[PDB]
């Protein structure tokens, strides 16, 4: 489905509704029908929903790189002048919500509508037709939402123990519906280690043979140890699917959805992913992920590490000041000293960040970001290149957390612009190549 601005829908379908409201007696002749639509008399809206029903439309965003840049959807009348785009098709369209625009096309003939529903329909195109990898697979927010859902926290609230001597196990629940009643009260944590009995889900392979092997668990009860979230996660997958019981990285999510395509019809994958979306969002907001100057941490070893290579640099620079050193070698040496230190600060930085920090969780889960990126935010941005394409031996010791300096900043843009200029000519040439491949 897609959100279609009702004003836009009205004009697109104008000849269709004009007929409809002449069929119903709203208007006596075609001339009256045309004025009725132009002035937007309120009767037309109910009529529009009629003609637009199950009548597909093509959505395109430029530039169109692969055929997935055009996909058919089911139009839904929407208030406002914008277009509502399903969050799982952004990957294929490469659609930023920074203010991108998209074109709508109305297929007319029976054949055109058939081609839309069958060939180009959104839910029938999931995997990229290049690598076969899944595209509509969750990303960004939906990653961190599920990654948080499935993660396991040592010593959370309600953790199964299990009890000894005077008490029974204490980490057990009659059903999943019970662990919910326990979670709503302060008793249970979604990330807790508890074990539960599950009638309506399917155990894994190995634990399946040992428990039943008759056999199966269509209505049957069985017990495994998992986080409450991992239970709810597996309620999103098809009932016939085995119980994964992992914390979901992006790759782990890719593994599963790749697997659903091999073992299941497309409609199943279409709906499975829709459920991953709804869940991932709900838990992305409950995830408690934000950013702050505080949540940006800097390694304390950075100072000493910094001055450690400052001496090695000034000494090797002292060897060049002595006259014996080859000028190209001294500068070249400064690259290797500083390039190396950049890793130690990266090693030192990664070591400092608690694993639950919001900045790191984003990159860990594979939702978005790099370590190289989080290395410039805190720690050091590192060496930068001159416009000549060489490496300026002067490092940027500051990070964008502490702020750069007048000269540190003037040097960065030196290269940072040359890169933004490249991105310009990289689409101009890449498109020139694609046009030759196509022909």
């Amino acid at each position: 489905q897609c959100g279609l601005p009702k004003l836009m829908a009205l004009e697109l379908f104008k000849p269709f509704v004009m007929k409809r409201l002449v069929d119903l007696n709203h208007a006596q002749n075609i001339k009256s029908a045309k004025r009725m639509v132009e002035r937007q008399r309120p009767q037309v809206w109910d009529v529009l929903e009629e003609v637009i029903a199950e009548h597909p439309v093509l959505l395109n965003r430029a530039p169109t790189l692969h055929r997935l840049g055009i996909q058919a959807f089911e139009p839904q009348l929407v208030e406002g002048k914008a277009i509502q785009l399903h969050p799982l098709v952004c990957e294929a369209f490469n659609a930023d919500f920074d203010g991108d625009q998209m074109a709508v096309h109305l297929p007319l003939s029976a054949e055109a509508q058939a081609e839309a529903r069958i060939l180009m329909l959104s839910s029938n195109n999931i995997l990229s037709p290049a690598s076969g990898k899944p595209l509509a697979m969750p990303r960004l927010d939906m990653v961190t939402g599920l990654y948080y859902l499935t993660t396991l926290v040592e010593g959370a609230t309600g953790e199964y123990q299990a009890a000894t001597k005077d008490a029974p196990e204490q980490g057990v629940y009659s059903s999943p519906a019970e662990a919910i009643m326990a979670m709503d009260r302060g008793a249970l944590s979604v990330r807790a280690k508890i074990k539960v009995r599950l009638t309506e889900l399917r155990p894994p392979t190995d634990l399946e043979a040992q428990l039943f092997e008759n056999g199966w668990k269509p209505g049957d009860a069985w017990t495994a140890e998992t986080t409450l979230g991992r239970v709810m996660f597996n309620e999103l997958l098809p009932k016939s699917y085995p119980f994964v019981n992992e914390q979901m990285h992006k790759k782990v999510q890719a593994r599963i959805i790749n697997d659903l395509a091999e073992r299941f019809p497309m409609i199943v994958v279409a709906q499975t992913v829709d459920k991953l979306k709804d869940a991932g969002f709900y838990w992305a907001t409950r995830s408690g992920v934000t950013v702050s100057m505080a949540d940006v941490l800097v390694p304390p070893q950075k100072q000493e590490i910094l001055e450690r290579h400052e001496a090695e640099a000034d000494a090797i620079e002292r060897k060049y000041q002595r006259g014996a050193l080859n000028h190209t070698e001294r500068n070249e040496s400064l690259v290797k000293i500083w390039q190396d230190a950049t890793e130690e600060v990266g090693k030192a930085l990664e070591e400092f960040y608690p694993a639950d920090n919001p900045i790191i969780t984003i990159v860990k889960s594979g939702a978005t970001g790099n370590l190289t990126q989080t290395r410039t935010l805190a720690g050091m941005k590192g060496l930068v290149t001159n416009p000549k394409g060489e490496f300026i031996p002067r490092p940027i010791k500051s990070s964008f957390r502490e702020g750069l300096t007048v000269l540190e900043y003037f040097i960065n843009t030196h290269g940072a612009r040359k890169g933004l200029a490249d991105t310009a000519l990289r689409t101009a040439d890449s498109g020139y190549l694609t046009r030759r491949l196509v022909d």
């Binding site: 003939s109 029976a110 509508q113 409609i267």
Partner: protein, 76 residues
């Protein structure tokens, strides 16, 4: 199979439709011509072999007809 319940355009599922024709392309012409066939009747002449929905669009009808194996076709 339990896929839950398809909404609108996704019904009937492609997979259950693709067993009724050689390819996705054949499925297109299959349903497409049957739709042009139905619309004529409302003015070839035959069908709606299935029970029409309330307002149902002929193309949507022809897809249901194909799902129930209510028509046969011969590729060229």
């Amino acid at each position: 199979s339990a896929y839950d319940t398809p909404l609108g355009i996704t019904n009937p599922p492609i997979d259950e439709l693709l067993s009724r024709a050689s390819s996705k392309y054949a499925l297109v012409i299959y349903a497409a011509k049957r739709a042009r066939q139905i619309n004529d009747y409302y003015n070839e002449y035959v069908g709606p072999l299935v029970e029409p929905g309330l307002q149902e669009k002929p193309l949507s009808i022809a897809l249901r007809e194909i799902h129930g194996d209510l028509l046969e076709h011969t590729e060229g």
